[PDB]
Amino acid sequence: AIRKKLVIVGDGACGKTCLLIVFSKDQFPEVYVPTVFENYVADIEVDGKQVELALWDTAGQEDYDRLRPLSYPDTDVILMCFSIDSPDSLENIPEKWTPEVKHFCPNVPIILVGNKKDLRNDEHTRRELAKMKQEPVKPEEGRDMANRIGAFGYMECSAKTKDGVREVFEMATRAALQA
Amino acid sequence: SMEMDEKDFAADSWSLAVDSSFLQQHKKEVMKQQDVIYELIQTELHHVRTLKIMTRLFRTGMLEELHLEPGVVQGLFPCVDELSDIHTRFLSQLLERRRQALCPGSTRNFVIHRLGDLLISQFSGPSAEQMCKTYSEFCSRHSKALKLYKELYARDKRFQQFIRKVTRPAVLKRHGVQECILLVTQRITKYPLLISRILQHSHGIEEERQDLTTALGLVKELLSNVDEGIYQLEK
Numbered sequence A: 001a002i003r004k005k006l007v008i009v010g011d012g013a014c015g016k017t018c019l020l021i022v023f024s025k026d027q028f029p030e031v032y033v034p035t036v037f038e039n040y041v042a043d044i045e046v047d048g049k050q051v052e053l054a055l056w057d058t059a060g061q062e063d064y065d066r067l068r069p070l071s072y073p074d075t076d077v078i079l080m081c082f083s084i085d086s087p088d089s090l091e092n093i094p095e096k097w098t099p100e101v102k103h104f105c106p107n108v109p110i111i112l113v114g115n116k117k118d119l120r121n122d123e124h125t126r127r128e129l130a131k132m133k134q135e136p137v138k139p140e141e142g143r144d145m146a147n148r149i150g151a152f153g154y155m156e157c158s159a160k161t162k163d164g165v166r167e168v169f170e171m172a173t174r175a176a177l178q179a
Numbered sequence B: 001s002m003e004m005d006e007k008d009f010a011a012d013s014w015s016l017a018v019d020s021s022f023l024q025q026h027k028k029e030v031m032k033q034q035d036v037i038y039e040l041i042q043t044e045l046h047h048v049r050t051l052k053i054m055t056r057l058f059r060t061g062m063l064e065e066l067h068l069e070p071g072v073v074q075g076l077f078p079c080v081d082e083l084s085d086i087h088t089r090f091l092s093q094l095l096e097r098r099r100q101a102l103c104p105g106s107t108r109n110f111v112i113h114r115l116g117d118l119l120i121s122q123f124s125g126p127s128a129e130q131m132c133k134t135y136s137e138f139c140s141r142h143s144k145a146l147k148l149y150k151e152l153y154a155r156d157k158r159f160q161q162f163i164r165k166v167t168r169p170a171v172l173k174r175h176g177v178q179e180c181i182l183l184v185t186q187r188i189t190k191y192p193l194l195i196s197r198i199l200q201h202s203h204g205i206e207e208e209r210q211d212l213t214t215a216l217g218l219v220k221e222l223l224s225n226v227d228e229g230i231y232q233l234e235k
């Protein structure tokens, strides 16, 4: 089992902490959802290759530009997250996060991940977004942004229901394994 | 880590740590506030455990088994004794607040009502000046430490056997040398998230809401000072 490193980046409300928790526990916490994620080493077998994938979060580091890059050394794959119920978190991807991740992690594959896809057909979400003249991110808007920033791929998932979560991390392992 | 503390913090939440009959006696809001306070102490216990792996297992093992030059070991684990001293003191005060709160005849049922004052003390005065000075030095030496580690691992065979030996047990799966360094660096930025969620469920007593609000600001001031005093050293 080779060792690879994964770092999740994105705005505070992109749902990156919850994605790391649901993946590591293989369950959406029934009794208590933790506020923080420390670290985890996942045993993943993708395409017949066994990998030890270390998972890291950047939550809490968004306002601290000199503390935050300390999470980047030797990263093998970046999960660049945004929330499907938040068109604003998608806007910050090519402006702030992509130039930072390409400067500290040159040549590292990036997977643009659209979180909270369950809210794309949630009525409370649709009514709330209309007050600010917005609507949920469409799957093609995500694909276009992923193409624009030169991401390795574009994927979607829902931490609430676990749908698409295993595939995100299995594709990250595949990307981390490539030259 | 000691068996007493590990057992007290083995459960995934405060709601599962306390007896079911005691849990039923509390309002939903108190259960939520206690769940987040328990998470803060449980993650602090894990953090102090991480610094003990660095001092006793790695640092000490390199000095005694490998007989490595003290300046080399210092380069690898900068400020580890000062860091260990800051958080073992903080953890002691948190577990003593839990201990005083225990119901008579019980080793698990408790409710902490005054966390705010403990957080204001920790993130103010001399203890805040020491955290700021220590993390500014540790974080500024982060890259130099990883570079020194990679060099030693790739050039010395006895160092590689040592690392493979001490990190072999399953209880060390997430705690390699570089993993421990990033765990410690990321610790300080976890506090505002934990304090804010405690504050969200602490509106019952106005004094507590004010203390936690002051504490949140002192943590953010500290983080801003550490962030501004960082510059990556390069050898």
Ligand SMILES: Nc1ccc2c(ccn2C(F)F)c1
Pocket: A065, A069, A099, A100, A103
């Ligand atoms: N060229 C360059 C240099 C440093 C950068 C970026 C984007 C973020 N940072 C960093 F300082 F946070 C871009």
